[PDB]
Amino acid sequence: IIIATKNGKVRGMQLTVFGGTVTAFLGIPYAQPPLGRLRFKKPQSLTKWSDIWNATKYANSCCQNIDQSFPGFHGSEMWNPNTDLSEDCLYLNVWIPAPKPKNATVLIWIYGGGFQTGTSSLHVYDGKFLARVERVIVVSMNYRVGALGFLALPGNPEAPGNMGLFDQQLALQWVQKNIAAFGGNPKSVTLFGESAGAASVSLHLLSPGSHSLFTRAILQSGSFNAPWAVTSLYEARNRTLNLAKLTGCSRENETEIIKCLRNKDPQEILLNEAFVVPYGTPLSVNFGPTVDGDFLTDMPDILLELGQFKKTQILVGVNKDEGTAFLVYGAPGFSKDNNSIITRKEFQEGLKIFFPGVSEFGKESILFHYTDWVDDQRPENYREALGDVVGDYNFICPALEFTKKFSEWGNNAFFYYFEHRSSKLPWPEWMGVMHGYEIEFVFGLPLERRDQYTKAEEILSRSIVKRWANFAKYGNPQETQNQSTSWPVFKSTEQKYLTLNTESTRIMTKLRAQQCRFWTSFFPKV
Ligand SMILES: *[C@@H]1O[C@H](CO[C@@H]2O[C@@H](C)[C@@H](O)[C@@H](O)[C@@H]2O)[C@@H](O[C@@H]2O[C@H](CO)[C@@H](O)[C@H](O)[C@H]2NC(C)=O)[C@H](O)[C@H]1NC(C)=O
Ligand SMILES: *[C@@H]1O[C@H](CO[C@@H]2O[C@@H](C)[C@@H](O)[C@@H](O)[C@@H]2O)[C@@H](O)[C@H](O)[C@H]1NC(C)=O
Ligand SMILES: *[C@@H]1O[C@H](CO[C@@H]2O[C@@H](C)[C@@H](O)[C@@H](O)[C@@H]2O)[C@@H](O)[C@H](O)[C@H]1NC(C)=O
Ligand SMILES: *[C@@H]1O[C@H](CO[C@@H]2O[C@@H](C)[C@@H](O)[C@@H](O)[C@@H]2O)[C@@H](O)[C@H](O)[C@H]1NC(C)=O
Ligand SMILES: CN(CCC1CCCCCC1)Cc1c[nH]c2c(O)cccc12
Ligand SMILES: *[C@@H]1O[C@H](CO)[C@@H](O)[C@H](O)[C@H]1NC(C)=O
Ligand SMILES: *[C@@H]1O[C@H](CO)[C@@H](O)[C@H](O)[C@H]1NC(C)=O
Ligand SMILES: [Cl-]
Ligand SMILES: [Cl-]
Ligand SMILES: [Cl-]
Ligand SMILES: [Cl-]
Ligand SMILES: [Cl-]
Ligand SMILES: [Cl-]
Ligand SMILES: [Cl-]
Ligand code: NA
Structure with a gap:
């Protein structure tokens, strides 16, 4: 029940799961609380304690603005925080098998x-x-988000940027120093995340300071090269200065700005965070990763292209309808409560929402490539095209491009296309296999037979869980016992990928080849 860590004893709690037991340690602290003069700084290491820390409930979530677009609707509120918001939020969780493992592989979410x-x-x-x-150990951590985690005066240590990434890193370090006492194997750690978590995983592959802190990596619906994932140093500075203007903290001495922002209440920072972008999108990342010369020594496109990353195996994938969820957060004619048949004019309006900084020719070029169809009279033509535009541009084509570039340096990569819509999905049918709704299958919720998932969904989750655990333990995402389809390595020539669904997994080639030729070759020129 009690485990001695290098900073003090922690007490866990016993859970009953599927007629057995898991020991959960919820809310172990891994850094000094980043309060007062520590706000906006890199996480500081933790002072030893003498008593038994009680890790028996989830800790505070980090300060953040909540989605209030659909009050009372589980489809959006299931993503909102379920613990008190607080700046005191640098905590992590550990689930270990019972009986205690001897040298378990570790999964870090x-x-x-x-x-x-x-x-x-x-x-x-x-x-x-x-x-x-699967008898793995599962670790997850809270890391600072928003301005509190990613405000950047690049080069200034009072607000250097990438603080939430360093929070994540300090938790990986905690696993290296402490997980053996929990029965874990520090030499067998797989990071996985979904995104921005996936984008975070891909940047740990790029950061030299994280290379010794994990073994393998899983990227669900995200990578750093996605257009929403990295802020240029230019926007980062202009966004910090805008927040100072909005808070009345505009000073000349850039350090006096940060001091002024340290005396503001978290709410004042949070409510001003929204309007710092000039023209935002539903996918706007106001304060995100930047090139800080510390966690990220150069522009990450350059690092990827020139092979400057941890050589290891990766598992990467995307969902069939990544883009649909975002359409009801601003695109005209769209609504989760009707079938969202939009016209050509509404589609053109929609592009302006998702490509605010793009020229007319750039938007016309999107329209040209996505509006040549079979039957022109199909009324959902424009509705589906906009979803595909948003999904291809923001998720599928960057994930495929990441996987191609990564595998070109000799490493084994495995790519999946998740195409099962959960039977319990509270969002409407036109949104299909949405962004975020593979996660519950990866974590095995449909294995709980009390949860109104179908039988085929329990099977699919069982297969996915085994593949993910085999990738983490062995670098190879096979399900070897129940004669499953073999998952081939993704090569840059053949570009084979595996489809995940309840009616036969299939090997396919060259996902969205024609669309991604537009987004990866043409569109960055505009
Ligand atoms: C689908 O609904 C949208 C959103 O309208 C709101 O939600 C509905 C469920 C209903 O309660 C409406 O009364 C609400 O206003 C509709 O979008 C509106 O469309 C009209 C006419 O096209 C336009 O004047 C409004 O500005 C739109 N409002 C928006 C985009 O927020 C849409 O028409 C509906 N689609 C279908 C096929 O019925
Ligand atoms: C830490 O926890 C100690 C143990 O309390 C336990 O809690 C209940 C729910 C049962 O599980 C039972 O085993 C114990 O009573 C406490 O005695 C101690 O006060 C706690 N310390 C702090 C600071 O919360
Ligand atoms: C625990 O296991 C260690 C070896 O781990 C294995 O090798 C590394 C390189 C990874 O590929 C990982 O996935 C493997 O499981 C041993 O060196 C170590 O001595 C073991 N320790 C104990 C206490 O059993
Ligand atoms: C594999 O299947 C188990 C039950 O299926 C039965 O056993 C397999 C070996 C086949 O003979 C099949 O025809 C039988 O119906 C599940 O209990 C188990 O969880 C499955 N494992 C995975 C990893 O999916
Ligand atoms: C980015 N959206 C995420 C919501 C969905 C929920 C279900 C699918 C899976 C998770 C993502 C919300 C949002 C944040 N900021 C916004 C903004 O500025 C304008 C408009 C919208 C937003
Ligand atoms: C940020 O960029 C916008 C867009 O050009 C500009 O209007 C604004 O002045 C910039 N912020 C500052 C503090 O200059
Ligand atoms: C701003 O920061 C501190 C003030 O406490 C000090 O280094 C100095 O006064 C200022 N530095 C510059 C470069 O203006
Ligand atoms: Cl201060
Ligand atoms: Cl909950
Ligand atoms: Cl498809
Ligand atoms: Cl299956
Ligand atoms: Cl089994
Ligand atoms: Cl082919
Ligand atoms: Cl395709
Ligand atoms: Na397709």
């Missing part, structure tokens, strides 16, 4: 939320099923 939101205590990130079913 990094949640998404656009680097502005998210928390490890969400129900769909409960690691007790993975620890129980």
Whole structure:
């Protein structure tokens, strides 16, 4: 029940899972609380304690603005924090199998939320099923988000940027120093995340200071090269200065600005965070990762292209309808409560919402490539095209480009295309296989037979859980016992990928080849 860590004893709690037991340690602190003069700084290491820390409930989530677009609707509120918001939020969770393992592989989850939101205590990130079913140890941490985690005066140590990434890193360090006392193997750690968590995982592959802190990596619906994932140093500075203007903290001495922002209440910072972008999008990342010369020594496109990353195996994938969720957060004619048949004019309006800084020719070129169809009279033509535009540009084509570039340096990569819509999905049918709704299958919630998932969904989750655990333990995401389809390595020539669904997994080639030729070759020129 009690485990001695290098900073003090911690007490866990026993959970009953599927007729067995998991030991959960919820809310272990891993840094000094970043309060007062510590706000906006890199996380500081933690002073030893003498008593028994009680890790028996999720800790505070980090300060963040909540989605209030659909009050009372589980489809959006299931992503909102479920613990008190607080700056005192640098805590992590550990699920270990019972009986205690001897040298268990470790899975470390990094949640998404656009680097502005998210928390490890969400129900769909409960690691007790993975620890129980596959006997891995599951670790998850809270890391600072928004301005509090990513405000950047690049080069200034009072606000250097990338603080939430350093929070994540300090938790990986905690696993290296402490997980053996929990029965874990520090030499067998796989990071996984979804995104912004996936984008975070891909940047740990790029950061030399994280290379010794993990073994393998899983990227669900995200990578750093996605257009929403990294802020240029230019916007980063202009966004810091805008927040100072909005808070009345405009000073000349850039350090006096940060001091002024340290005496503001978190709410004042949070409510001003929204309007710092001039023209935002539903996918806007207001304060995100930047090139800081510390965590990220150069522009990450350059690092990827020139092979400057940890050589290891990766598992990468995307969902069939990544873009649809975002259409009801601003695109005209769209609504979760009707079938969202939009016209050509509404589609053109929609592009202006998702490509605010792009020229007319750039938007016309998107329209040209996505509006040549079979039957012109199909009324959902424009509705589906906009979803595909948003999904291809923001998720599928960057993930494929990341995987191609990464595998070109000799490493084994595995790519999946998730295409099962959960039977319990509270969002409407036109949105299909949405962004975020593979997570519950990865974490094995449909293994709980009391949860109104179908039988085929329990099977699919069981297969996915085994593949993910085999990738983490062995670098190879196979399900070897129940004669599953073999998952081939993704090569830059053949570009084979595996489809995940309840009616036969299939090997396919060259996902969205024609669309991604537009987004990766043409569109960055505009
Ligand atoms: C789908 O609904 C949208 C959103 O309208 C709101 O939600 C509905 C469920 C209903 O309660 C409406 O009364 C609400 O206003 C509709 O979008 C509106 O469309 C009209 C006419 O096209 C336009 O004047 C409004 O500005 C739109 N409002 C928006 C975009 O917020 C849309 O027409 C509906 N689609 C279908 C096929 O019925
Ligand atoms: C830390 O926890 C100690 C143990 O309390 C336990 O809690 C209940 C729910 C049962 O599980 C039972 O085993 C114990 O009573 C406390 O005695 C101690 O006060 C706690 N310390 C702090 C600071 O909360
Ligand atoms: C625990 O296991 C260690 C070896 O781990 C294995 O090798 C590394 C390189 C990874 O590929 C990982 O996935 C493997 O599981 C041993 O060196 C170590 O001595 C073991 N310690 C104990 C206490 O059993
Ligand atoms: C594999 O399947 C188990 C039950 O299926 C039965 O056993 C397999 C070996 C086949 O013979 C099949 O025809 C049988 O119906 C599940 O209990 C188990 O969880 C499955 N494992 C995975 C990893 O999916
Ligand atoms: C980015 N959206 C995420 C919501 C969905 C929920 C279900 C699918 C899976 C998770 C993502 C919300 C949002 C944050 N900021 C916004 C902004 O500025 C304008 C408009 C919208 C937003
Ligand atoms: C940030 O950029 C916008 C857009 O050009 C500009 O209007 C604004 O002045 C900039 N912020 C500052 C503090 O200059
Ligand atoms: C601003 O920061 C501190 C003030 O406490 C000090 O280094 C100095 O007065 C200022 N530095 C510059 C470069 O203006
Ligand atoms: Cl201060
Ligand atoms: Cl909950
Ligand atoms: Cl089994
Ligand atoms: Cl498809
Ligand atoms: Cl299956
Ligand atoms: Cl082919
Ligand atoms: Cl395709
Ligand atoms: Na397709």
